[PDB]
Write a protein that binds this ligand. Structure first.
Ligand code: CU
Ligand code: CU
Ligand code: ZN
Ligand code: ZN
Lengths: 153, 153
């Protein structure tokens, strides 16, 4: 079993802690935790390629996309490995994260350790937006908070 | 060449950016960077096991030691994988780091990606201090700043 943890922080008030657990196998990864001070509504949630936070969340690069596909939702056939969809913040700005994904991994190739998890400004349209940007970023907007995914015990 | 980067920050003014570069899977890793706001003198510099900073540098765990070896310096046969010795801060409190290590790696089992790089308050005795702590931590003291090592371009 492998565990990973990520502490999200940004230029503003958004902060949170997301845990990852991949039961003793190369099976699905369970992602869970919470993010606070988020505006009410949907927020794009993705794993970006670089675990470089030298210029904040901007240096994290594009979505992790080892297979060079187009952006999509988590349950779509075509998506970037790092496409985790949207998390939802309530009227209090708290987003409860509970995701189970079988595309990301905590080990080998589709490995997200040492990469950046980011929560966005707007909702991810899951590639259905009908414009150029939709198939790249899902039109999720700016990066509110991010963190480098590290190994945990 | 594989690259990684680490942004060091702590509950203090100590901060720095360290770059890692490894040409081949087997081969030395060059670590280059600089940290500032340090007190002039020697300061412990090690890779700790967990990339967990939920509780600051406190949650990074002990030195990365997959081989169950005792604490030492970079040139010692007997050393933890994460033992990078001392970093020297000058009168202005700036510590330039230019290390080449053959035990740490950005690939494989000794992989430091996703773990925490930490700069200590005191000098690291390189495990020659003659007491339990020396063979454990090198008596380097507090963790002033730290960061999770992530993938870079
Ligand atoms: Cu994103
Ligand atoms: Cu240490
Ligand atoms: Zn995407
Ligand atoms: Zn050590």
């Amino acid at each position: 079993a492998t565990k990973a943890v990520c502490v999200l922080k940004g230029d503003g008030p958004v902060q949170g802690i997301i845990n990852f657990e991949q039961k003793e196998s190369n099976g699905p990864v369970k992602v869970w935790g919470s993010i606070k001070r988020l505006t009410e509504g949907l927020h794009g949630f993705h794993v970006h390629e670089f675990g470089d936070n030298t210029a904040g969340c901007t240096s994290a690069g594009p979505h992790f996309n080892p297979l060079s596909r187009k952006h999509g939702g988590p349950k779509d056939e075509e998506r970037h490995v790092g496409d985790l969809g949207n998390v939802t913040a309530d009227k209090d700005g708290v987003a409860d994260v509970s995701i189970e994904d079988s595309v990301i991994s905590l080990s080998g190739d589709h490995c997200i350790i040492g990469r950046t998890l980011v929560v966005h400004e707007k909702a991810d349209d899951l590639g259905k937006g009908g414009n150029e940007e939709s198939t790249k970023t899902g039109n999720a907007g700016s990066r509110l908070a991010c963190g480098v995914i590290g190994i945990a015990q």
